[PDB]
Amino acid sequence: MSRMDNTELPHPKEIDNETLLPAAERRVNSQALLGPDGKVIIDHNGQEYLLRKTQAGKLLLTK
């Protein structure tokens, strides 16, 4: 029973940086944070931040 050579070439590196696009570009005010839509950008505090309903069954607040 001979040895098979351990230590090899590493797994694939991040050599791609194409970023995913927002769930929506709809800047509606804070009270309409979801509405009947589910995925909109919240306009509040002199800022904006995208809150979306992920289909898996969650909320996702993103700056």
UniProtKB/TrEMBL annotation:
InterPro entries: Hemin_uptake_protein_HemP. Pfam families: hemP. Residues 1-22 are annotated as: Disordered. Coiled coil: none annotated. It comes from the Bacteria. Residues 1-16 have a biased composition (Basic and acidic residues). This is Cytoplasmic protein.
